[PDB]
């Protein structure tokens, strides 16, 4: 919300590098060069197939949550969706975009 006057749902991908750099080392990236870890990590990890500069906040906070703990390999992404839909409380049709 620092760069966003209101929620607006989505932000541009140009400022994503600065957004990921402006996070604490425990949550974001270490003090080392982001060209080796951040660039490869953002591409390798699963991200929703949205437009060039419209990515929702729930499409990024969920990705960070997944990366923080028990990150799973590609292809088995539906197991996490099943776990949320069967263990966590009601999704209220909010995981439709979060599936990808």
């Amino acid at each position: 919300s620092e760069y966003d006057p209101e929620a607006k749902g989505r932000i541009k991908h140009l400022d994503v590098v600065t957004l990921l750099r402006r996070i604490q080392p425990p949550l974001g990236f270490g003090k080392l060069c982001p060209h080796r870890v951040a660039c490869k990590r953002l591409v390798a990890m699963n991200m929703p197939l949205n437009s060039d500069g419209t990515v929702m906040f729930n499409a990024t906070l969920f990705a960070l949550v997944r990366t923080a703990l028990k990150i799973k390999t590609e292809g088995n992404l539906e197991q996490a969706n099943e776990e949320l839909r069967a263990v966590i409380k009601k999704i209220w049709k909010k995981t439709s975009m979060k599936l990808l």
Binding site: S1, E2, D4, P5, N58, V65, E83, I88
Partner: protein, 135 residues
């Protein structure tokens, strides 16, 4: 007896106790409002209001009022009492000045968004109602 039974939920099929709250908070969340107007002819005042050194000075200026209040004692002198009065006048005046300088930048329409933001306005309003009954 509440640490066990209290958190006696057995839904931890795959997720540990750390995931019992973070996933739920991720599911239920909403970005806040920053309220950033460009407005070039008052953008300078807007930047001055919302700046780290300004608040770093506000803290040490507000705590001075409380340090002044924690100085009155029984059967104090008349000159000390008058100094207390003039310090109170200075403090209420500077609070009014800061409030009127802030409301221009943050606008009256968003002035009620933050609980502490509009609360200080009542403090200034209250501090001025009894300004003429002292003398």
């Amino acid at each position: 007896t509440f640490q066990e039974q209290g958190e006696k939920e057995y839904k931890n099929c795959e997720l540990d106790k750390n995931q019992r709250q973070c996933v739920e908070y991720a599911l239920k969340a909403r970005p806040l409002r920053r309220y950033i107007p460009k407005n070039p002819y008052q953008y300078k005042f807007w930047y001055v209001v919302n700046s780290s050194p300004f608040e770093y000075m506000m803290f040490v200026l507000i705590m001075l009022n409380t340090l002044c209040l924690a100085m009155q004692h029984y059967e104090q002198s008349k000159m000390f009492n008058d100094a207390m009065d003039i310090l109170n006048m200075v403090f209420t005046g500077v609070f009014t000045v800061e409030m009127v300088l802030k409301v221009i930048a943050f606008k009256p329409k968003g002035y009620f968004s933050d609980a502490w933001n509009t609360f200080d306005s009542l403090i200034v309003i209250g501090s001025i109602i009894d300004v003429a009954l002292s003398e």
